[PDB]
Amino acid sequence: GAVVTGVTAVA
Amino acid sequence: GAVVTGVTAVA
Amino acid sequence: GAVVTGVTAVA
Amino acid sequence: GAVVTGVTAVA
Amino acid sequence: GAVVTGVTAVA
Amino acid sequence: GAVVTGVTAVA
Amino acid sequence: GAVVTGVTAVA
Amino acid sequence: GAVVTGVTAVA
Amino acid sequence: GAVVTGVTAVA
Amino acid sequence: GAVVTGVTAVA
């Protein structure tokens, strides 16, 4: 099917 | 300061 | 300061 | 200060 | 101060 | 079926 | 089915 | 099916 | 400061 | 199917 990964960061 | 926005989707 | 918004969805 | 909003959904 | 809002749903 | 997990935090 | 995980944080 | 993961952060 | 926006999607 | 990964960051 589908594997959707999102990361938005200020580290 | 900081404005951090993240969207992860299967629409 | 900080405004952090996250959305994770299957619509 | 801080405004943190999170949404996780299957709609 | 702080405004923290979380929503987890299957609608 | 479905496994939906949401975490919103200021730690 | 579906495995949806969301994390929104200020740590 | 689907595996959707989202991370929004200020660490 | 900083304005960080991320979008990850299968539409 | 599909494997979609997105990273947006200020580290």
UniProtKB/Swiss-Prot annotation, chains A, B, C, D, E, F, G, H, I, J:
Highly expressed in presynaptic terminals in the central nervous system. Expressed principally in brain. Transmembrane segments: none annotated. Phosphorylated, predominantly on serine residues. Phosphorylation by CK1 appears to occur on residues distinct from the residue phosphorylated by other kinases. Hallmark lesions of neurodegenerative synucleinopathies contain alpha-synuclein that is modified by nitration of tyrosine residues and possibly by dityrosine cross-linking to generated stable oligomers. It comes from the Eukaryota. Coiled coil: none annotated. It is found in: Cytoplasm; Membrane; Nucleus; Synapse. It is linked to Genetic alterations of SNCA resulting in aberrant polymerization into fibrils, are associated with several neurodegenerative diseases (synucleinopathies). SNCA fibrillar aggregates represent the major non A-beta component of Alzheimer disease amyloid plaque, and a major component of Lewy body inclusions. They are also found within Lewy body (LB)-like intraneuronal inclusions, glial inclusions and axonal spheroids in neurodegeneration with brain iron accumulation type 1. Parkinson disease 1, autosomal dominant: A complex neurodegenerative disorder characterized by bradykinesia, resting tremor, muscular rigidity and postural instability. Additional features are characteristic postural abnormalities, dysautonomia, dystonic cramps, and dementia. The pathology of Parkinson disease involves the loss of dopaminergic neurons in the substantia nigra and the presence of Lewy bodies (intraneuronal accumulations of aggregated proteins), in surviving neurons in various areas of the brain. Soluble monomer. Homotetramer. A dynamic intracellular population of tetramers and monomers coexists normally and the tetramer plays an essential role in maintaining homeostasis. Interacts with UCHL1. Interacts with phospholipase D and histones. Interacts (via N-terminus) with synphilin-1/SNCAIP; this interaction promotes formation of SNCA inclusions in the cytoplasm. Interacts with CALM1. Interacts with STXBP1; this interaction controls SNCA self-replicating aggregation. Interacts with SNARE components VAMP2 and SNAP25; these interactions allows SNARE complex assembly and integrity. Belongs to the synuclein family. The 'non A-beta component of Alzheimer disease amyloid plaque' domain (NAC domain) is involved in fibrils formation. The middle hydrophobic region forms the core of the filaments. The C-terminus may regulate aggregation and determine the diameter of the filaments. Neuronal protein that plays several roles in synaptic activity such as regulation of synaptic vesicle trafficking and subsequent neurotransmitter release. Participates as a monomer in synaptic vesicle exocytosis by enhancing vesicle priming, fusion and dilation of exocytotic fusion pores. Mechanistically, acts by increasing local Ca(2+) release from microdomains which is essential for the enhancement of ATP-induced exocytosis. This is Alpha-synuclein. It comes from Homo sapiens (Human). The gene is SNCA.
